[PDB]
Amino acid sequence: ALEACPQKRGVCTRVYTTTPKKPNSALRKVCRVRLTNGFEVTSYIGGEGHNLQEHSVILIRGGRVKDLPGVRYHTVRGALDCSGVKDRKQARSKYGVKRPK
Amino acid sequence: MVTIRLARHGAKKRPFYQVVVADSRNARNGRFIERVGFFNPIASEKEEGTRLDLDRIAHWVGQGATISDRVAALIKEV
Amino acid sequence: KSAKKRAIQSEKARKHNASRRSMMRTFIKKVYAAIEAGDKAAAQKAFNEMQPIVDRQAAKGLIHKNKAARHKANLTAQINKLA
Amino acid sequence: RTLQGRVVSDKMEKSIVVAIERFVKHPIYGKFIKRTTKLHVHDENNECGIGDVVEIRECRPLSKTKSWTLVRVVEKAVL
RNA sequence: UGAAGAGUUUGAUCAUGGCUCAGAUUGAACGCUGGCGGCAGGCCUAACACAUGCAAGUCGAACGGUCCGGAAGAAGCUUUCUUUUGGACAGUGGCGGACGGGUGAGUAAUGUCUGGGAAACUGCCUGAUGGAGGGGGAUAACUACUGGAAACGGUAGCUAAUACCGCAUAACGUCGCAAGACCAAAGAGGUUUUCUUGCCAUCGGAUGUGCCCAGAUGGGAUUAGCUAGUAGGUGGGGUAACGGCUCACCUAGGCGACGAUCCCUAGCUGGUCUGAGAGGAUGACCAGCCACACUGGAACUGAGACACGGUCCAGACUCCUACGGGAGGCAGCAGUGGGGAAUAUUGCACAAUGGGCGCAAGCCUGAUGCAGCCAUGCCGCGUGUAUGAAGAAGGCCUUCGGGUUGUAAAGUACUUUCGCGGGGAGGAAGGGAGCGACGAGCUCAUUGACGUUACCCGCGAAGUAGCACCGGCUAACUCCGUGCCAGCAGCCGCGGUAAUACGGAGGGUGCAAGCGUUAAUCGGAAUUACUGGGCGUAAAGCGCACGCAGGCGGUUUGUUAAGUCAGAUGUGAAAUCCC
């Protein structure tokens, strides 16, 4: 986070998929982000589905993904272009999802 | 110019003044030279509304110390 | 009031003290010159016209106390010497 | 103030440098540490020579570096 | 009166060792949710660019004209006009902007901190002494004329003071020698022969400062030799004053491993947080000091600013413009745009307190006192109270016998936050007038933001709750769905058809308008160990010798007594902390 900041905005460079390590197997969704800090790191995209393109531009929280070595940050859904998970009836605090009527 | 005025310890609904001698430059509630007494507008905390300690101010007065209009009233009441 | 008045007075103020010191260094040198030459009479007489003038500059904010006394001492110190 | 030191140099005229030494405890450890200082004391009589352990007192600044003057000589010589 | 540790490197054990955890705090932000009140608190991110308004005047007891107001005249009335008078503006003249307010960029240095020294200075105010005789001179306003689009400007004529200047006395003071000579100063107002305000010179008081000195003040030597005014001397110049501070001449030194020089960084402190202590971190609110207002530099005038709404020069930018030429500079208050995860009313008001000027009346005062916005924090309060089945319905479980959610809801009775009506606050005396000599003193009268709010009385309806978590550490369980797929995850791990660790539901635990999340600070670490540690094999004696500095040093006696120890005294600001 550089300036020891809780969060840090940035613009996605590419939204590709990655495969877990030896014990796990899947297509985890990640994305290279060029934070304002001046660093280009990879962040994980929580949720069952997202809408992050090339010029996504999202805020970074910070969290390592055990399965994906290198991914030390998590994207904050519900902020900027990163739309909150759809139909999230559960932990809406995370994934940034407004409580349905 | 040394002056004898009232320092406001004054708190919410607790207004108390401290007739003190201090340089006119210093703030109203700053470092004072010496306390000569106290004043209680409501005189509720204690029956002794004010304690002038005449002899004390009697010294500062003549030393070049001037008393404000309000303080002069209290001091005059001795 | 007029903030410019204070500006013009200050300028013309220096022009005043500037001339006063001129008279000082002019005669002080004259006295010293006379003393150096050996002319006692003319020298001292010229020395006197330098004393009150430097004393007068002290009267106002021209030369002030100290610096005024300095000049008197230095002048009389240079005249009684070369003489 | 009076200070005791040694005459480590009598090269200059009417001026002698006295090397005063003191012992102070370290602010952290506390163990005694050695510290010295050179002071240009006045000596109009050029009475003090090198090796003389003299006393030094504060006096009217003779010069910019000299603000001390020789008071009395403790011992005769120690090179 | 003050110190609990635990989890994980093994097949198991012990040791070494690193990582990690429950607590408290934050001028925070984010997610879901959200009723009231009191106090407190709010760009912690760009000196990025800025629309608009606002950020010091006051005197007619210093003098001549306009604007606003009153009164009395010449007149039958009107027009017009005359005298007197109040306020104020415009001008002339006097005294004040270097205080207060903002910010921290820059800054390692007697800059600051602590304790001293002296080569010094100080308006108004206060005490004491003495004095105030005679005379002379000058510039605007105003009037007339001309130039310019404007700003504003040129010329001619008149004129005043507590404005300037020359002469007297010497209380004294200055200079040479020793025990001589030189040098000063404006009135005005009145209850006007008496006071009031003010002036000149000198001494002192009060207070505030300039300068110097001892000690103390971060990181790196992959920063080591450095220096010519550079070190010192004589003389001179310069300043309020010491000083190479500057100059001439002479000498040749001065500094360094107790680290100079260079480079990097950050306003400093009282204090704040933490800790058993030592110590570590920090210095944001408030208080002291320091340094900065378009960018850079500079000086003038002054007790003081080298001075935000003063001036001069260089530079960029913005606006105005008949382009000839001008006007500015929100890192001042509020606010706008841009930035960011994020931080507010371009509000009310001076009566109270305080400040500037004035004899006073009085004038000025977004300093401040308040309200507004935001659960940002802290404390207080409410969403109800009592009753109510061996025990409804519904959901859930079942050996379907039954059990569970439950007195929990329904329902009965009671009180009754909001809301409505009435009352309605503390926070504040004089000017003036009467008595007294409109003096001292005494007496009497008139007048308030937040509020019609707080609070009191009366009436009076039951009247929002949510969020996180339940494998272990961590207190709190089942069913279903899914199925190493989807996903979870601080660490150990979990999921390949029976999962308390995934999703839902019932239930349960915690807390409560709050609840979680993210980021940051503290010890445990006796893992730099002074108190508290080690080096034959776990990390660790330099290969040896010689030797400089430095550190350390045998027995007896005497002097000093610097270290050390003891008594007294001064200092150690306030606040804070503790009782």
Side-chain angles (χ1 to χ4, degrees), chain B residues 2-74:
Chain B
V2 56
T3 301
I4 311 77
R5 59 174 178 294
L6 297 67
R8 174 185 176 62
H9 319 82
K12 288 60 185 178
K13 289 62 182 179
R14 186 181 302 97
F16 295 129
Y17 300 67
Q18 185 183 179
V19 52
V20 177
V21 182
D23 191 301
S24 181
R25 301 192 188 70
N26 299 301
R28 56 191 299 294
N29 295 179
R31 188 189 68 63
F32 53 108
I33 303 300
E34 178 188 301
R35 60 282 288 296
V36 64
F38 55 69
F39 169 56
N40 184 181
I42 183 62
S44 180
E45 65 156 57
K46 304 297 179 59
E47 297 178 297
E48 293 62 60
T50 61
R51 184 178 62 178
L52 176 56
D53 190 303
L54 183 61
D55 299 301
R56 198 71 290 291
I57 183 178
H59 181 60
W60 286 112
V61 177
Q63 173 69 300
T66 177
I67 56 179
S68 301
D69 300 300
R70 289 296 178 177
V71 67
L74 301 176

Side-chain angles (χ1 to χ4, degrees), chain D residues 13-16 41-47 62 66 69:
Chain D
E13 61 180 302
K14 305 181 301 301
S15 300
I16 287 70
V41 306
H42 180 57
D43 184 50
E44 57 177 57
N45 300 178
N46 60 63
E47 176 184 55
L62 178 66
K66 301 182 63 180
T69 302

Side-chain angles (χ1 to χ4, degrees), chain A residues 28-100:
Chain A
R28 311 305 175 64
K29 299 298 179 300
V30 300
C31 64
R32 312 184 71 65
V33 182
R34 294 187 173 182
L35 299 304
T36 59
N37 302 299
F39 288 60
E40 299 63 60
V41 300
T42 301
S43 60
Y44 185 62
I45 312 303
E48 49 272 57
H50 62 300
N51 302 61
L52 300 176
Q53 298 179 56
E54 302 181 303
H55 313 61
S56 301
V57 182
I58 182 56
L59 183 65
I60 297 300
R61 186 197 65 178
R64 173 172 172 293
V65 182
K66 196 73 175 183
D67 298 334
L68 303 176
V71 183
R72 311 175 66 179
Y73 315 76
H74 281 62
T75 186
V76 181
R77 303 197 60 171
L80 297 179
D81 296 60
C82 182
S83 301
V85 182
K86 287 294 181 299
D87 299 300
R88 254 279 168 162
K89 315 291 291 185
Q90 40 181 296
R92 295 157 185 167
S93 180
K94 299 177 66 293
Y95 305 112
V97 184
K98 301 181 182 60
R99 180 183 63 181

